[PDB]
Design a protein around this ligand. Structure first.
Ligand SMILES: OC[C@H]1O[C@H](O[C@H]2[C@H](O)[C@@H](O)[C@@H](O)O[C@@H]2CO)[C@H](O)[C@@H](O)[C@@H]1O
Ligand SMILES: OC[C@H]1O[C@H](O[C@H]2[C@H](O)[C@@H](O)[C@@H](O)O[C@@H]2CO)[C@H](O)[C@@H](O)[C@@H]1O
Ligand SMILES: OC[C@H]1O[C@H](O[C@H]2[C@H](O)[C@@H](O)[C@@H](O)O[C@@H]2CO)[C@H](O)[C@@H](O)[C@@H]1O
Ligand SMILES: [Ca+2]
Ligand SMILES: [Ca+2]
Ligand SMILES: [Cl-]
Ligand SMILES: [Cl-]
Length: 646
């Protein structure tokens, strides 16, 4: 890149953008940043306190020359304003500012529609993008975060396989198509997903990500990217629409997607990346108010805790404002039902709690989960929204990595075994996740105050898939033996307290051919392979059965830590097993008691059962040789569930 000029210090009373004092000036509190369109007129408002001049630049085409360049009026609390008294429909615009001696041109940070590749703001009456009946759109019910079953999905993965039977492959609208068939007539797409019994689809980045990741003008050529490279936070990604050149198309089709998912009983969680931008020098934030929206060390270099080049300065009030209004826009405009915060440890506690509060005033059933890893940054340690500070983040879920590693083995040392694959000493790790990560007792405690704070998982888009990790850590084993370990791991997720999270394709043992980090690998690596799905319908049914077992038993879904400490009991069990009971109608369970065995021992075992009444088999009967008087005779790797009826 070229030159960054942080401003003529006399424009802001001698106070530099880097000064702590700066945060108390220009604290704009209005609701109208960006552009408000109507046929009569359009009103623009930009926050640019360090600029000495500011212009609205109008274009007639997404690539044309400027047709108009209009000065803005210096307004209150650091903002500039303009009213254009023409019908601006179908126009495009940018802002041009002078900061120091530099002139910079930039998309509106509050852009709601953009041209192709997102380099100009597009002026649009967004009510014209609503699908028919949008006002009647109703959410499926959701009584507790522990009642969710999350399915993590990438819009391109879903349909791009050539046998997916979906017409609009790789597009938002691909996930609206019903009755789509794959190899040998199996259901694919939305019908496959609703068939599973999952409750929430969690979509990898659907905000507009950088042209460097996917070029929206060359979709006739191979392309793929997860999209963790944010460019326009409040507009949908162009490559997922049928026409990235038509500003309304991506907006209307995302809404048609969310509407259809809601009609079929599914809620939508948005993966959201407010911790960094695609390029800190070129982003509109830096062109318009250089030095303010991103984090700097003391020597004026970017803080780089993300390893992505930059960090967003969430703790500065105007950025905090920006992030909250961004969240609220996706709620209000697109009816989103949840957010998954990438590297949430980079966001400050105040911001996250304020997000939780604002969403609670709208609808407390909107989910908030995140990656609360402990990671270094210029943000002081006591302000980071991570696992160490979970007790200051009521209501916010975090991925439980201790559970993940204990179950399937270490994700960074590929060959190391975990509980499912016969490693030694992982039983307590598994037990801590069964209890929902809470301070259960003794050495059985993790970071969670309440079970709604723990997301259990054994696979996601990142790192090896569960099947690929098992293969790298079980060199002796057969494919039969590996499938049993895979199934055991899914069963542990779906019978642990907290919030179960599944990766799309885990139900048919999704593989990436051993690729560990597939963020820009081709579609051949990354697609949902509906051929493999057709060959694994038994495994798919097993997963659907696990999901229905969790839905049938509120004891697996307790809401509070007090309930878990009162109803969950760990039983004596030999090495390479975990056994526990959920006693006395836990959480309203129909049965009097439940007994769960996680058995990673391949041979025959004779187990003592607690004397709680006449046990009977409810799941895993294929592993049970007998159920006597009181003892259980078992062979095989897998989960067994017993119950004492009412
Ligand atoms: O932006 C490119 C970037 O994408 C991925 O990094 C993600 C990762 O998937 C997230 O779960 C989390 O760890 O943060 C990153 C986004 O902030 C790739 O892993 C990475 O190689 C790549 O550079
Ligand atoms: O984006 C950085 C990093 O994020 C995750 O790594 C976590 C890991 O999962 C945790 O168990 C713990 O060790 O903290 C790490 C972050 O410092 C991703 O799993 C990893 O791929 C990625 O590079
Ligand atoms: O809940 C019914 C049943 O679920 C599982 O049985 C699966 C089986 O494992 C699959 O291979 C396939 O045959 O479909 C079955 C029904 O979904 C459990 O294994 C079993 O214990 C349980 O009763
Ligand atoms: Ca894009
Ligand atoms: Ca809540
Ligand atoms: Cl495409
Ligand atoms: Cl930390």
């Amino acid at each position: 890149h070229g030159t960054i000029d942080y401003g003529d210090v006399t424009v802001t009373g001698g106070i530099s953008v880097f000064d702590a004092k700066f945060d108390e000036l220009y604290v704009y509190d209005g609701d109208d940043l960006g552009a408000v369109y109507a046929p009569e007129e359009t009103r623009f408002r930009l926050w640019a306190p360090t600029a000495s001049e500011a212009f609205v630049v109008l274009y007639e085409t997404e690539d044309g020359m400027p047709v108009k360049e209009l000065p803005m009026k210096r307004d209150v609390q650091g903002t500039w304003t303009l009213t254009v008294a023409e019908d601006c429909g179908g126009l495009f615009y940018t802002y041009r500012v002078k900061v120091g001696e530099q002139w910079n041109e930039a998309v509106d940070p509050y852009a709601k529609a953009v041209g192709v590749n997102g380099t100009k703001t597009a002026i649009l009456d967004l009510r014209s993008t609503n699908p028919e009946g949008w006002e009647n759109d109703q959410k499926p019910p959701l009584a507790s975060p522990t009642d969710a079953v999350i399915y993590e999905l990438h819009v391109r993965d879903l349909s791009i396989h050539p046998q997916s039977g979906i017409r609009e492959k790789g597009k938002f609208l691909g996930l609206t198509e019903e009755g789509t068939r794959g190899p040998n007539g199996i259901p694919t797409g939305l019908d496959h997903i609703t068939g599973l019994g999952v409750t929430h689809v969690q979509l990898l980045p659907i905000y507009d990500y950088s042209q460097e990741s996917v070029d929206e003008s060359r979709l006739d050529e191979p392309h793929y990217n997860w999209g963790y490279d944010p460019q326009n936070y409040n507009v949908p990604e162009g490559s997922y629409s049928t026409d990235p050149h038509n500003p309304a198309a991506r907006i209307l089709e995302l809404k048609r997607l969310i509407q259809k998912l809601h009609a079929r009983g599914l809620r939508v969680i948005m993966d959201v990346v407010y911790n960094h931008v695609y390029d800190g020098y070129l982003i509109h934030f830096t062109k318009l108010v250089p030095g303010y929206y991103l984090r700097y060390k003391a020597d004026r270099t970017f803080s780089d805790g993300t390893f992505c080049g930059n960090e967003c300065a969430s703790e500065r009030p105007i950025m905090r404002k920006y992030i909250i209004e961004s969240i609220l826009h996706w709620v209000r405009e697109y009816h989103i039902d949840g957010f998954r915060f990438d590297l949430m440890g980079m966001i400050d506690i105040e911001t996250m709690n304020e997000i939780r509060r604002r969403l609670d005033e709208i609808d407390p059933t909107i989910l908030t989960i995140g990656e609360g890893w402990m990671m270094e940054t210029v943000l002081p340690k006591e302000l980071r929204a991570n696992q160490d500070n979970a007790e200051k983040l009521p209501g916010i879920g975090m991925f439980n990595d201790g559970m993940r590693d204990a179950v399937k083995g270490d994700i960074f040392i590929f060959d190391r075994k975990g509980f499912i694959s016969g490693g030694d000493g992982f039983e307590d790790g598994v037990k801590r996740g069964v209890a929902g990560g809470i301070n259960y007792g003794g050495q059985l405690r993790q970071f969670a105050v309440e079970p709604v704070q723990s997301v259990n998982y054994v696979e996601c888009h990142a790192n090896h898939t569960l099947w690929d990790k098992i293969e790298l850590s079980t060199p002796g084993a057969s494919d039969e033996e590996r499938r049993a370990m895979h199934r055991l791991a899914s069963a542990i997720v779906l019978t642990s307290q907290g919030i179960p999270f599944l990766h799309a394709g885990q139900e048919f043992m999704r593989t990436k051919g051993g690729v560990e980090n597939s963020y820009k690998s081709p579609i051949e690596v990354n697609w949902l392979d509906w051929e493999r799905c057709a060959a694994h319908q038994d495994d798919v049914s097993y997963m659907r059965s696990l999901i229905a077992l969790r839905k049938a038993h509120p004891a697996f879904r307790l809401k509070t830590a007090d309930e878990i400490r009162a109803h969950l009991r760990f039983e004596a069990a030999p090495p390479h097993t975990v056994a526990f009971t959920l006693r006395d109608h836990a959480g309203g369970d129909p049965d009097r008691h439940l007994y769960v065995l996680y058995n990673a021992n391949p041979g025959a075992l004779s187990l003592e059962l607690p004397a709680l009444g006449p046990w009977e088999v409810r799941f895993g009967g294929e592993h049970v040789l007998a159920l006597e008087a009181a003892r259980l005779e078992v062979r095989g790797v897998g989960v067994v569930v017993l119950a004492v009826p009412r």
